[PDB]
Amino acid sequence: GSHMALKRIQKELSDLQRDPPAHCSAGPVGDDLFHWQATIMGPPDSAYQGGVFFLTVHFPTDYPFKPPKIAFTTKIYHPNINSNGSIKLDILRSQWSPALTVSKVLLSICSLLCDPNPDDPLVPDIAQIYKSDKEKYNRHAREWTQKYAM
Amino acid sequence: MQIFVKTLTGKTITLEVEPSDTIENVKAKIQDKEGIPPDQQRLIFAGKQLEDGRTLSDYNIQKESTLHLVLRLRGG
């Protein structure tokens, strides 16, 4: 149960420490390995560049056989991320696999920032702005990055 | 006959409708005004979700009635 999951989590953390990734930072908030905080930097060339985005990561007791619960703490303007930080992403639910790690999820969220999924959105308004007025989208995302993530 | 549509941001948009219009037609008007595709919007009125086949008359949506525009997400 929790011993197994805690062992898997310790392995993932040890891998992140042994070869840190370029795409994010991640680690336990304190002594509870089930509760992690992560950070992703606004991808270069995107409307979020310069910003720092904080994620909360919570491991279920059945990890790695149940997906981790990941959400945004920093406010962001995105079609697949709403105002209170909920994320719409396949690997975080229907397409989760025990072979995946938090590192790969954060990688996929970086790609998601660089390339949203407006055809199955969490914020229809932002999705339609993204599809039909890219300039407006980049403007609002840049504004929110300057206002919340810097 | 015009009706109102209140979004989850507090905005209230006005629509020019006829009592015979269907929920689908109203969703097309909401799309023309706000851009949201029909399959992504859900309309609430008098405590119930409005279905595509029905008309405004079938729900007793009178003049200056208030509709509630809410999310209709798919799998998260």
Curated annotation (Swiss-Prot), chain A:
Autoubiquitinated in vitro. It is found in: Cytoplasm. Pathway: Protein modification; protein ubiquitination. Its EC number is 2.3.2.23, 2.3.2.24. One of its GO terms (molecular function) is ubiquitin-protein transferase activity. It catalyses: S-ubiquitinyl-[E1 ubiquitin-activating enzyme]-L-cysteine + [E2 ubiquitin-conjugating enzyme]-L-cysteine = [E1 ubiquitin-activating enzyme]-L-cysteine + S-ubiquitinyl-[E2 ubiquitin-conjugating enzyme]-L-cysteine; S-ubiquitinyl-[E1 ubiquitin-activating enzyme]-L-cysteine + [acceptor protein]-L-lysine = [E1 ubiquitin-activating enzyme]-L-cysteine + N(6)-monoubiquitinyl-[acceptor protein]-L-lysine. Component of a E3 ubiquitin ligase complex containing UBE2D1, SIAH1, CACYBP/SIP, SKP1, APC and TBL1X. Interacts with RNF11. Changing residue 119 to R: Decrease in autoubiquitination. Accepts ubiquitin from the E1 complex and catalyzes its covalent attachment to other proteins. In vitro catalyzes 'Lys-48'-linked polyubiquitination. Mediates the selective degradation of short-lived and abnormal proteins. Functions in the E6/E6-AP-induced ubiquitination of p53/TP53. Mediates ubiquitination of PEX5 and auto-ubiquitination of STUB1, TRAF6 and TRIM63/MURF1. Ubiquitinates STUB1-associated HSP90AB1 in vitro. Lacks inherent specificity for any particular lysine residue of ubiquitin. Essential for viral activation of IRF3. Mediates polyubiquitination of CYP3A4. Residues 4-150 form the UBC core domain. It comes from Homo sapiens. The active site is at residue 88. This is Ubiquitin-conjugating enzyme E2 D1. SUPFAM superfamilies: UBC-like (SSF54495).
Swiss-Prot record, chain B:
It is a peripheral membrane protein. Changing residue 65 to A: Prevents phosphorylation in case of mitophagy. Decreased localization of PRKN to mitochondria. The record marks 54, 72 as: Interacts with activating enzyme. Changing residue 74 to K: No effect on ADP-ribosylation. Phosphorylated at Ser-65 by PINK1 during mitophagy. Phosphorylated ubiquitin specifically binds and activates parkin (PRKN), triggering mitophagy. Phosphorylation does not affect E1-mediated E2 charging of ubiquitin but affects discharging of E2 enzymes to form polyubiquitin chains. It also affects deubiquitination by deubiquitinase enzymes such as USP30. Mono-ADP-ribosylated at the C-terminus by PARP9, a component of the PPAR9-DTX3L complex. ADP-ribosylation requires processing by E1 and E2 enzymes and prevents ubiquitin conjugation to substrates such as histones. There is a cross-link at residues 6, 11, 27, 29, 33, 48, 63 (Glycyl lysine isopeptide (Lys-Gly) (interchain with G-Cter in ubiquitin)). The modification (Microbial infection) ADP-ribosylthreonine is found at residue 66. The modification ADP-ribosylglycine is found at residue 76. Residues 1-76 form the Ubiquitin-like domain. There is a cross-link at residue 76 (Glycyl lysine isopeptide (Gly-Lys) (interchain with K-? in acceptor proteins)). The chain holds residues 1 to 76 of 229 of the full protein. It is found in: Cytoplasm; Nucleus; Mitochondrion outer membrane. It comes from Homo sapiens. This is Ubiquitin.
